[PDB]
Amino acid sequence: METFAFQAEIAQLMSLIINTFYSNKEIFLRELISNSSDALDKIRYESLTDPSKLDSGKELHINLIPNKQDRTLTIVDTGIGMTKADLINNLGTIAKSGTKAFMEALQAGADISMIGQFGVGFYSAYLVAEKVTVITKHNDDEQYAWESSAGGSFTVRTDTGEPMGRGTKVILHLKEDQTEYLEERRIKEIVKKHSQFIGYPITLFVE
Numbered sequence: 001m002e003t004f005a006f007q008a009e010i011a012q013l014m015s016l017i018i019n020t021f022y023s024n025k026e027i028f029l030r031e032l033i034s035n036s037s038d039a040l041d042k043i044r045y046e047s048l049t050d051p052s053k054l055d056s057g058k059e060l061h062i063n064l065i066p067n068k069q070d071r072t073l074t075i076v077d078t079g080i081g082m083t084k085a086d087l088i089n090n091l092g093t094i095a096k097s098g099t100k101a102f103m104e105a106l107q108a109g110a111d112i113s114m115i116g117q118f119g120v121g122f123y124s125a126y127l128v129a130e131k132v133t134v135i136t137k138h139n140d141d142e143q144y145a146w147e148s149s150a151g152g153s154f155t156v157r158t159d160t161g162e163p164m165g166r167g168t169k170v171i172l173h174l175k176e177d178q179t180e181y182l183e184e185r186r187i188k189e190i191v192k193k194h195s196q197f198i199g200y201p202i203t204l205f206v207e
């Protein structure tokens, strides 16, 4: 396990998301589903030039998996996945520029719900989660686990968990008062409101 320090801008955004009083927390799910949809569009588009890009799995889908025992909500997609370089370097660049633009927009009067317009919607996961684990597999790299409970650091390690084939899993270790996001009726409600036109099958798993 390697440990890395978040740069100042992203660290400030994470504290803002964790600390600001904002009741409309449900938007995290729309953001993660839009991210999944964008990752699936990416592998699908690449597959048009190279069909072998789907040798790692032909199915293009999004699964929403709640687990009341573990208090987790997992968003699984079979999209492009992320390499080690994406996790550590490339997305660090995006977190910095995206946070700076979002922070400026917020000062002007924009809402926390507009986060996805700044390419950092992934960080809305901290509205409901005390810890976020990202398990990912890109065709050109190994399976990795990125993890952060904020506090200024994140970790990256090669993942020894169940082999995924290709894609990303965002595991949300929910805050104690955010367990409504494990309830079937609640997830179904959010998906219908914000994600009804996503061009991939969204399967809401039950327990």
Ligand SMILES: O=C1c2ccccc2C2=C(c3nc4ccncc4[nH]3)CCCN12
Pocket (backbone or CB within 6 Å): 006, 007, 010, 035, 086, 087, 088, 089, 091, 092, 093, 094, 095, 098, 119, 120, 121, 122, 123, 134, 146
């Ligand atoms: O989906 C997104 C995403 C979307 C937008 C921005 C960053 C991320 C992002 C990650 C990330 N933020 C970082 C911050 C600093 N240095 C390395 C970093 N890597 C890793 C997990 C997935 N992720």
